[PDB]
Design a protein around this ligand. Structure first.
Ligand SMILES: C=CC1=C(C)/C(=C/c2[nH]c(/C=C3N=C(/C=C4\NC(=O)C(C)=C4C=C)C(C)=C\3CCC(=O)O)c(CCC(=O)O)c2C)NC1=O
Length: 240
């Protein structure tokens, strides 16, 4: 991320989370993942503010697509988006996070390891490791929208209230990533029927995430409806 144009000007929590995600991935057996049109940086404006986006995307045998996206709208909204999309053959959950900030601080911080099983449960080893982290305390919890039924019982959705909480959230993401990368070492290829189950779960996750009209509006204001639909369905939440 040394080379990032956006990083120097992003919200400090976002910066730390980008660094933590990059550090988690850094020594993995990474290969490039070409986004549509081999997208990297993109900017657009219509009648209002400009939206700037920086994309990074990789893959490994266990992760179909590892997407880290940074964005800024004019000087007023920052976003970090990340999803690690699993290879269904290994049945790992989906790591994701979305962090939205403005000049007044972080408004929204979401992170999860989301299920892909038909029973909507995380694998047993994830349940146990997550539980052992304890229930974090956060003073300003936010209720997920209906489409957020896709998220696990361990999902975080907060407005951080102070620096202590920002740090606690970052540390929880670090802990999620650590559990996830360890479980990916001990995962084995699954049966054809299980693979199919996990693929279904990932498809559903993406279809539900596409219902987030707050994200869609940011994209639309800078690029328009058609661009935004392409971006959400082909770049952010591609349905396998
Ligand atoms: C260009 C990309 C991009 C932008 C611009 C973006 C914006 C964005 N996401 C938001 C919410 C949100 N975002 C999520 C969740 C997620 N969203 C994800 O992309 C992932 C991976 C998760 C979860 C793992 C949820 C649950 C909300 C709240 C939606 C609501 O309040 O209705 C909001 C509202 C913030 C608030 O209410 O304080 C905005 C503006 N998200 C993006 O990804």
């Amino acid at each position: 991320l040394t080379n990032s144009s956006l990083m120097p000007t992003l919200n400090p929590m976002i910066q730390q989370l980008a660094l933590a995600i990059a550090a988690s991935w850094q020594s993995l057996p990474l290969k490039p993942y070409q986004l549509p049109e081999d997208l990297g940086y993109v900017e657009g404006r219509l009648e209002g503010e400009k939206l700037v986006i920086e994309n990074r995307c990789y893959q490994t045998p266990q992760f179909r697509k590892m997407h880290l996206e940074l964005a800024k709208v004019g000087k007023g909204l920052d976003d970090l988006h990340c999803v690690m999309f699993p290879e269904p053959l290994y049945g790992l959950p989906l790591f994701g996070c979305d962090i939205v900030a403005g000049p007044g601080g972080v408004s929204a911080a979401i992170a999860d390891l989301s299920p892909t099983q038909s029973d909507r449960q995380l694998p047993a080893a994830y349940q146990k490791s997550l539980a052992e982290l304890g229930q974090p305390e956060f003073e300003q919890q936010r209720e997920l929208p209906p489409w957020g039924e896709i998220f696990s019982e361990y999902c975080l959705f907060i407005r951080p209230s102070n620096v202590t909480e920002e740090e606690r959230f970052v540390q929880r993401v670090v802990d999620f990533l650590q559990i996830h990368c360890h479980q990916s070492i001990v995962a084995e290829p699954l049966s054809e029927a299980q693979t199919l189950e996990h693929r279904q779960g990932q498809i559903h996750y993406c279809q539900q995430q596409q219902k987030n009209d707050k994200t869609r509006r940011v994209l639309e204001k800078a690029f328009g409806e058609a661009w935004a639909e392409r971006y959400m369905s082909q770049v952010l939440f591609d349905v396998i």
